Amino acid sequence: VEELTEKCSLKTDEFLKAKEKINEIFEKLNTIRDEVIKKKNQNEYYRGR
Amino acid sequence: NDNPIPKSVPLHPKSGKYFHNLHARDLSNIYQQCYKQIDETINQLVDSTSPSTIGIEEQVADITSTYKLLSTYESESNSFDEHIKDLKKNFKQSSDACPQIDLSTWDKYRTGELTAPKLSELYLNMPTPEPATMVNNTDTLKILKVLPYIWNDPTCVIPDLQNPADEDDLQIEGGKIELTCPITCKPYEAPLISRKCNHVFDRDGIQNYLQGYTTRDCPQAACSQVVSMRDFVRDPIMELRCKIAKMKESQEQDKRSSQAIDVL
Amino acid sequence: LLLKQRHLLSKMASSMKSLKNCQKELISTQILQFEAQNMDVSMNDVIGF
Amino acid sequence: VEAQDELQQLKEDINSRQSKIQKYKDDTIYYEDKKKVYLENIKKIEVN
Amino acid sequence: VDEVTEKIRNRQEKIERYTSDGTTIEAQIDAKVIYVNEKDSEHQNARE
């Protein structure tokens, strides 16, 4: 049961780490998309200029 | 035998609470978020590249490979969850079938003469997931595959359902698809296509034609069928073609004006 | 930015199935601990009997 | 995020509760079987 | 047998109450799924 508690704790830790990593990857993709949209706004403003 | 540790025991109501609590981690939300992210990334990439810049084929191939891998992973996850549900159902049925240990049945199980279902052995014996009855074909995959041809030229005939080589033998004879409708001289603001007609319409004059008639024949040739307003669905291909055509005409006008002024 | 976003798409594709391996390792070795919990639940009842 | 967390925890809790309902139904079926065995014993005692 | 019968009676009453709560919770969770979907749409609008 102490081994089960350690196994449940490590599985929850791995689930939290995997979810945090995938959420951070999704947020990094969102930030990259935002940076690309900002660069597109800069590009369209440069095209307007 | 020896140390009294039986291989397996019949399920108990207290054990049943934990069995009910146990579940596969659900990734459906994560898969939907990943699919939305990749789809929006493809949509951003469609107009991100400079119209003058050419050579997007490798990026399109890489994204297609990533999408195919994601689809395979999603199919494997569906197989995993369905296998988990089937294993749980089989285990609960087997546990219900098996008798309960009270005085000596536990001793018989410990001696190994009596056997009870074990989730670990059933999970090890569970058949490996198979990507069967899964077709990796989506609207996003189709638009991603066809966007390089649209980038090369607005009018193309990529589908080869009628014949693998081309639309007909070696000669397409398909003419060109015009962004400007002959009925309405404007770009398609609302490109809608029917699943049966397979033709894109602006819907500005199509709604008026459908008004007063429950079903109307498709105005375009090469088909004979009647469809309602609800049959039409959004077609991203037509809007992508219109956007790329606008970007190319704008860039060519800018370049020609700049070159002419530089000459003077 | 397109190279970075394609690298991020490759990284998220690599995280895909890694999350599945984490899910499989979370469900696996947890059924064994659940069996150990069932063994303890049966054990307390049988020892009391 | 608070609403999503509350929804996920509620969904897990209600799934566990539904499984608790089905196991309680199984336990009641077992109790009814035990009651039927007890009624058979009562009928044998009554005939004796 | 009467003690077993009253135990079954309370257990089945609890099962019925739990089933009614489960039906209401399913309706409320569908409402919460719509609520979180509209909140997510509002979050996307706010973020854009």
Encoded tokens for D23: 């196991």
* Whether A3 contacts chain C with CB within 8 A: yes
Q: Is B156 a known ligand-binding residue?
A: no
Q: Are B45 and C47 in contact (CB under 8 A)?
A: no
How many contacts (CB atoms, under 8 Å) link B and D? 18
Q: Is B218 a known ligand-binding residue?
A: yes
Q: Does the beta-carbon distance from D35 to E33 stay under 8 Å?
A: no
Q: Is B199 a known ligand-binding residue?
A: yes
Nearest to C2 among B9, B45, B103 (CB): B45
Contacts of A29 in chain C (CB under 8 A): 5, 8-9, 12
Contacts of C30 (CB under 8 A, 6+ apart): A7, A8, A11, B22
Residue with tokens 């606008």: B246
- CA separation for the pair E31, E48 (Å, rounded): 25
Q: Does the beta-carbon distance from B44 to A22 stay under 8 Å?
A: no
Data resolution in angstroms: 8.5
- Residue B101 carries which side chain, given as an amino acid letter? I
* Whether A29 contacts chain B with CB within 8 A: yes
* Whether E12 contacts chain D with CB within 8 A: yes
Neighbours of chain A (3+ CB pairs under 8 A): B, C
Query: What's the gap in Å between the CA of C46 and the closest CA on chain A?
Result: 17
Q: Are A14 and C18 in contact (CB under 8 A)?
A: no
Give me the helices (H) in chain B, please.
Answer: 13-21, 28-48, 57-97, 105-111, 119-125, 139-152, 206-210, 236-263
Contacts of D23 in chain B (CB under 8 A): 13, 16-17, 20
* Whether A37 contacts chain B with CB within 8 A: yes
Please provide residue B56's backbone torsions phi and psi, each rounded to the nearest 5 degrees. -85, 0
Nearest CA in chain D to E2: D35
Q: What structural domains does chain B harbor?
A: 2-180+235-255 (1.20.120.1010), 181-234 (3.30.40.10)
Mutate to test the interface with A, among C26, C29, C32 (most CBs of A within 10 A): C26
Q: Are B91 and B120 in contact (CB under 8 A)?
A: no
> What is the experimental method?
cryo-EM
Q: Are C39 and B9 in contact (CB under 8 A)?
A: yes
Cβ count within 10 A of residue B27: 24
Q: Does the beta-carbon distance from E14 to D35 stay under 8 Å?
A: no
Burial class (CB in 10 A: 0-12, 13-18, 19+), E18: middle
- CA separation for the pair B210, B229 (Å, rounded): 7
Contacts 24+ apart (CB under 8 A), E5-13: E5/D35, E7/D31, E8/D28, E8/D31, E8/D32, E8/D35, E11/D24, E11/D27, E11/D28, E11/D31, E12/D28
Nearest CA in chain B to C32: B120
Q: Are D and A touching by the rule of 3+ CB pairs within 8 Å?
A: no
Burial class (CB in 10 A: 0-12, 13-18, 19+), B219: middle
* Whether C24 contacts chain A with CB within 8 A: no
Characterize the bridge pairing of strands B192-194 and B200-201: antiparallel
Burial class (CB in 10 A: 0-12, 13-18, 19+), B102: exposed
Q: What angle do CA B236, B239, B243 make, to 5 degrees?
A: 135
Give the residue from B210, B179, B180 showing the smallest Cα distance to B197. Answer: B210
Contacts of B254 in chain A (CB under 8 A): 47
Q: Does the beta-carbon distance from A26 to B34 stay under 8 Å?
A: yes
- CA separation for the pair C16, C10 (Å, rounded): 10
* Whether D45 contacts chain E with CB within 8 A: no
Which helix (H) or strand (E) segment holds residue B192: the answer is strand B192-194
Please provide residue B232's backbone torsions phi and psi, each rounded to the nearest 5 degrees. -70, 140
Q: Which residues of C3-24 are buried (b: 16+ CB within 10 A; e: fewer)?
A: eebbebbeebbebbbebbebbb
Give the residue from B142, B2, B160 showing the smallest Cα distance to B68. Answer: B142
Mutate to test the interface with A, among B29, B44, B45 (most CBs of A within 10 A): B44
* Whether A47 contacts chain B with CB within 8 A: yes
